[PDB]
Amino acid sequence: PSALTQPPSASGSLGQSVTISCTGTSSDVGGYNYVSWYQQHAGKAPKVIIYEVNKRPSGVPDRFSGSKSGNTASLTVSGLQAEDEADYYCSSYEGSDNFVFGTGTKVTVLGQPKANPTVTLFPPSSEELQANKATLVCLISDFYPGAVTVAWKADGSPVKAGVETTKPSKQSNNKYAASSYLSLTPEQWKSHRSYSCQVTHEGSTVEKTVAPTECS
Amino acid sequence: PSALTQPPSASGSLGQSVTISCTGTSSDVGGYNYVSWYQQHAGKAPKVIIYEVNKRPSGVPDRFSGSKSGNTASLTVSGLQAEDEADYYCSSYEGSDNFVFGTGTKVTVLGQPKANPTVTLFPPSSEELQANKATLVCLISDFYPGAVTVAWKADGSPVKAGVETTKPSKQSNNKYAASSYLSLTPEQWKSHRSYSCQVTHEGSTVEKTVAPTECS
Amino acid sequence: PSALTQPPSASGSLGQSVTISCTGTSSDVGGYNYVSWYQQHAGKAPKVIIYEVNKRPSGVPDRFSGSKSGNTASLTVSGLQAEDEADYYCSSYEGSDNFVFGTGTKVTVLGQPKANPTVTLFPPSSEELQANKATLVCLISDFYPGAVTVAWKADGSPVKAGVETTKPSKQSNNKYAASSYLSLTPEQWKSHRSYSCQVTHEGSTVEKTVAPTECS
Amino acid sequence: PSALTQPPSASGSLGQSVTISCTGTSSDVGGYNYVSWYQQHAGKAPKVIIYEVNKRPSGVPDRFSGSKSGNTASLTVSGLQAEDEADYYCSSYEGSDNFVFGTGTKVTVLGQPKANPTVTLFPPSSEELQANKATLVCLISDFYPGAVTVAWKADGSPVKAGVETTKPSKQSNNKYAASSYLSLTPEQWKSHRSYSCQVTHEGSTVEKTVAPTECS
Numbered sequence: 101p102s103a104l105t106q107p108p109s110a111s112g113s114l115g116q117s118v119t120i121s122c123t124g125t126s127s128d129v130g131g132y133n134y135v136s137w138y139q140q141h142a143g144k145a146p147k148v149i150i151y152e153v154n155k156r157p158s159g160v161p162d163r164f165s166g167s168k169s170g171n172t173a174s175l176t177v178s179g180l181q182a183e184d185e186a187d188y189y190c191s192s193y194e195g196s197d198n199f200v201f202g203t204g205t206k207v208t209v210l211g212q213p214k215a216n217p218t219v220t221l222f223p224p225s226s227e228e229l230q231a232n233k234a235t236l237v238c239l240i241s242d243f244y245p246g247a248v249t250v251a252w253k254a255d256g257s258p259v260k261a262g263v264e265t266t267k268p269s270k271q272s273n274n275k276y277a278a279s280s281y282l283s284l285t286p287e288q289w290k291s292h293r294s295y296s297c298q299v300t301h302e303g304s305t306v307e308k309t310v311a312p313t314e315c316s
Numbered sequence: 317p318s319a320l321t322q323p324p325s326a327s328g329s330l331g332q333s334v335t336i337s338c339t340g341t342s343s344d345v346g347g348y349n350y351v352s353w354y355q356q357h358a359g360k361a362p363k364v365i366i367y368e369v370n371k372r373p374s375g376v377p378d379r380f381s382g383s384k385s386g387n388t389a390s391l392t393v394s395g396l397q398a399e400d401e402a403d404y405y406c407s408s409y410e411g412s413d414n415f416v417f418g419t420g421t422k423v424t425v426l427g428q429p430k431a432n433p434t435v436t437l438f439p440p441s442s443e444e445l446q447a448n449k450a451t452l453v454c455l456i457s458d459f460y461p462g463a464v465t466v467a468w469k470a471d472g473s474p475v476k477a478g479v480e481t482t483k484p485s486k487q488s489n490n491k492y493a494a495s496s497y498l499s500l501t502p503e504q505w506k507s508h509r510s511y512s513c514q515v516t517h518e519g520s521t522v523e524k525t526v527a528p529t530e531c532s
Numbered sequence: 533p534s535a536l537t538q539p540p541s542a543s544g545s546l547g548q549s550v551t552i553s554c555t556g557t558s559s560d561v562g563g564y565n566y567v568s569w570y571q572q573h574a575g576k577a578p579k580v581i582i583y584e585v586n587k588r589p590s591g592v593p594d595r596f597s598g599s600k601s602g603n604t605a606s607l608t609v610s611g612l613q614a615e616d617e618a619d620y621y622c623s624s625y626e627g628s629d630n631f632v633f634g635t636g637t638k639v640t641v642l643g644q645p646k647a648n649p650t651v652t653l654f655p656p657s658s659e660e661l662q663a664n665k666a667t668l669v670c671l672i673s674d675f676y677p678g679a680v681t682v683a684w685k686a687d688g689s690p691v692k693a694g695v696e697t698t699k700p701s702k703q704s705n706n707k708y709a710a711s712s713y714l715s716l717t718p719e720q721w722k723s724h725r726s727y728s729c730q731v732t733h734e735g736s737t738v739e740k741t742v743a744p745t746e747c748s
Numbered sequence: 749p750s751a752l753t754q755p756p757s758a759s760g761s762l763g764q765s766v767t768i769s770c771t772g773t774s775s776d777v778g779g780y781n782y783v784s785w786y787q788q789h790a791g792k793a794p795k796v797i798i799y800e801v802n803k804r805p806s807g808v809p810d811r812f813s814g815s816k817s818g819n820t821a822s823l824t825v826s827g828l829q830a831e832d833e834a835d836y837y838c839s840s841y842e843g844s845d846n847f848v849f850g851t852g853t854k855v856t857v858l859g860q861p862k863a864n865p866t867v868t869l870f871p872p873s874s875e876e877l878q879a880n881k882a883t884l885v886c887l888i889s890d891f892y893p894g895a896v897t898v899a900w901k902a903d904g905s906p907v908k909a910g911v912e913t914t915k916p917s918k919q920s921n922n923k924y925a926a927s928s929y930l931s932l933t934p935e936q937w938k939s940h941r942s943y944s945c946q947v948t949h950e951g952s953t954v955e956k957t958v959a960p961t962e963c964s
Contacts, residue, residue, distance in 0.1 A: 143409075145420050161611075177611075197364075197372065202361060220451055221438075222453065225439055235455060239451065240496065241480070281455055315678065540776070576917075577786075577839075577849035577851060578786060589845065589846045619791075633793040636792070652883055652885070654870040681783070698926070701912075701927075702911045709927065709929070710912060711927035
């Protein structure tokens with residue numbers, strides 16, 4: 101059902117082999133084998149660049165690879181040309197109307213040297229508490245490529261709700277800045293010990309942990 | 317092969333509906349009966365809402381309508397749920413294990429009610445300052461529509477320095493959200509009465525202030 | 533011993549998979565397995581880009597492939613970047629001091645549309661005969677890429693000797709022009725029925741046949 | 749890794765000898781004992797003449813000499829066989845299944861005796877003309893050194909048109925060879941007394957003439 105788990109950002113040096121993946125859950129997403137790879141550009145329609153794990157519709161260079169082991173589907177660009185910088189998607193089919201997609205993946209031809217993100221989690225201002233409100237920020241910044249996964253945990257348990265996030269914005273130093281938020285009641289704030297904000301960028305994770313207080 | 321017609325626009329209002337184009341040939345669409353529509357929310361994975369021209373996928377609002385005759389395929393969206401604003405694509409089978417796509421149509425709901433941003437300045441932090449950095453952040457949330465301009469004060473003087481401000485993500489409904497951030501040192505910090513994040517939107521200006529008297 | 537038989541010209545469209553090969557003779561060149569691939573540029577030293585059929589010295593992209601079936605060694609560029617236009621060589625090792633090489637192969641990033649060569653075999657001028665001399669020309673021209681194999685046969689038997697050939701020269705229309713020759717005695721000329729000049733260019737051969745005469 | 753020193757030049761004369769550089773480090777050359785030299789004739793496959801510093805390959809002139817001490821490796825070529833003019837490269841082992849190369853040295857033999865080109869105009873042909881094309885060709889052969897300039901006459905008038913002339917290949921010894929060719933129609937052909945291919949080389953001008961009276 102719903103989601104295939106698919107990377108944030110993936111990127112190479114133009115000429116370098118870069119392989120993306122999709123993961124799943126056996127059911128739908130296993131040796132119950134289909135799964136297609138789509139390309140996208142700018143602000144455009146999807147475009148099958150693969151189907152049935154590994155077969156291409158026609159007009160696809162060999163370089164475009166498709167593989168599947170266990171729960172996880174691979175798609176390899178075996179010679180990145182600038183044209184290959186684009187957003188990609190894995191999708192799978194589950195009986196009747198269950199046309200599920202992955203999360204995405206953004207392949208970038210590495211312009212800048214590639215920075216990892218400064219995660220900064222903030223507690224609800226004691227004043228905003230005085231106003232009977234609660235909001236926590238994960239300021240994620242200083243990165244390139246500008247595609248990251250964002251998450252929030254309570255007591256090391258996934259905050260399913262209340263969560264919002266920003267799309268990466270260019271900065272005066274050619275970096276990306278995202279921001280995730282969580283809005284609650286002081287009561288929900290008060291009932292725990294640790295609220296985390298965990299972001300991912302290529303093979304780089306950061307969890308930022310924050311804890312409840314009164315300040316007064 | 318080639319790919320198939322759609323309109324650059326499509327509108328409506330709370331009720332007012334909209335119907336889209338997907339114009340192909342008897343080689344595809346006009347041939348087989350596999351009209352599928354992908355609801356591309358502004359930088360997202362697709363969420364198909366309809367395949368086989370007419371029968372909605374497992375959880376899609378009883379609202380989307382496959383509407384076709386020969387070489388033309390139409391989506392219909394009655395009762396504009398507004399939370400419909402998105403990129404809408406089509407895909408036709410054309411034999412030999414192949415599909416091709418409708419150009420894309422961008423739905424814009426009208427009669428969306430306007431709101432001013434909730435402003436929240438976030439004070440620099442303990443853990444933060446122990447690393448001896450001082451980062452101030454303005455969460456500019458829940459405003460429609462997505463124009464907003466941010467401005468920092470160092471006391472009275474209009475301060476621009478490390479003041480990085482992101483473009484307004486689409487907010488789990490057609491409310492917007494942007495982030496702002498001042499880069500400071502603990503020193504720059506406590507040498508100043510306040511700091512402010514003046515946010516102006518649709519005439520209405522809101523502005524919050526922070527003082528080093530906090531438990532950070 | 534001596535030669536591995538290796539193509540004339542090989543070339544792609546930049547982004548397209550291009551595979552070169554080497555052929556041999558079992559003895560030396562068989563399941564008596566080694567064989568290395570070297571690159572070259574401009575006027576420069578060779579450069580191992582592969583060894584032991586398929587292993588790379590370090591600083592070689594995955595794209596660089598190496599394979600061996602039966603008598604024939606493959607080397608595939610799985611994503612040609614302009615930098616990949618260069619001359620290539622296969623080489624094999626035969627006991628003690630037998631470090632044999634292939635003929636070559638030139639990989640070109642296809643600038644021009646790729647032309648095949650106008651072969652034109654000429655008989656010894658009756659006058660040059662009057663001068664007791666014999667020379668035959670294979671004017672090979674109008675091609676791109678400018679790397680061709682040239683050969684000469686007598687009675688459908690390989691002219692081992694007397695043979696010379698020119699390196700491809702650029703022309704006012706950006707084409708290459710080569711010229712092979714054969715010098716003999718009128719006696720050797722007279723003793724046969726058919727002198728051929730057979731040239732190759734990618735998967736395109738032309739044999740040009742000429743026959744002895746007196747003219748008077 | 750990196751690659752190793754050689755001189756851009758190396759000379760001698762019929763006797764006079766030459767000795768080359770291959771200067772590396774104790775990581776390679778100065779370490780293991782695998783000094784190998786590749787005799788790159790101007791656009792050719794390598795022909796190794798020496799491996800393991802000193803013992804010549806299976807058929808290499810009893811003339812080439814591996815000459816080394818520590819970090820310097822020298823080839824020596826006594827008794828300049830002139831047919832030695834070529835690009836000369838080295839290669840050092842550096843552990844872990846790896847080799848690296850000497851920059852290249854270009855041997856130039858002096859005291860090479862000079863000769864004027866044998867000129868041969870080739871008359872347009874029967875088979876040729878039956879296809880109704882008229883191609884005239886000048887074989888400019890066996891001249892040292894490789895400067896020669898070609899010139900066509902249409903009767904008396906100096907004619908340039910389709911007169912494509914190639915650069916002088918190296919001729920199975922250090923004699924040179926170039927080709928020239930006039931593009932004509934059978935008509936242009938027989939409307940003219942003669943045609944000539946004036947070839948000037950080192951002061952001496954040679955010029956051959958062709959007339960439609962031939963059995964072509």
